[PDB]
Amino acid sequence: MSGLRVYSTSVTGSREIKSQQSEVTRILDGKRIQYQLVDISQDNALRDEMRALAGNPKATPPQIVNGDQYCGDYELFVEAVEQNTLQEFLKLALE
């Protein structure tokens, strides 16, 4: 059983972060995906829970997670669809 929980910021804090979260959900939304959104903006616990499990207190709201592990981030995911690599990060070639 493999799930997908993308992190984001509902309340939003910065003015640029909104541009990132939008681009992320934009692609997924257009793809008509049924993934959840683990927004840390809800509870502060998610903030100190994501940075910990992520092993990096420099990350950002946009973070792709597969269940309970660090799947990727904004740069990665976005850096994939660009060259059509998104699969290598999503399906990882499960043909």
From Swiss-Prot:
The keyword DNA damage does not apply. One of its GO terms (cellular component) is extracellular exosome. Keywords: Acetylation, Cell membrane, Cell projection, Cytoplasm, Glycoprotein, Membrane, Nucleus. The modification N-acetylserine is found at residue 2. Glycans are attached at residue 9. Ubiquitous. Expressed in heart, kidney and liver (at protein level). Expressed in brain, lung, spleen and skeletal muscle. GO terms for biological process: cytoskeleton organization. It comes from the Eukaryota. It is found in: Cytoplasm, Cytosol; Cell projection, Ruffle membrane; Nucleus. Residues 2-93 form the Glutaredoxin domain. May be glycosylated. The keyword GTP-binding does not apply. Could act as a modulator of glutaredoxin biological activity. May play a role in cytoskeleton organization. Homodimer. Interacts with MYO1C (via its IQ motifs); the interaction is dependent on calcium and takes place at membrane ruffles. This is SH3 domain-binding glutamic acid-rich-like protein 3. The lineage of its organism: Eukaryota, Metazoa, Chordata, Craniata, Vertebrata.
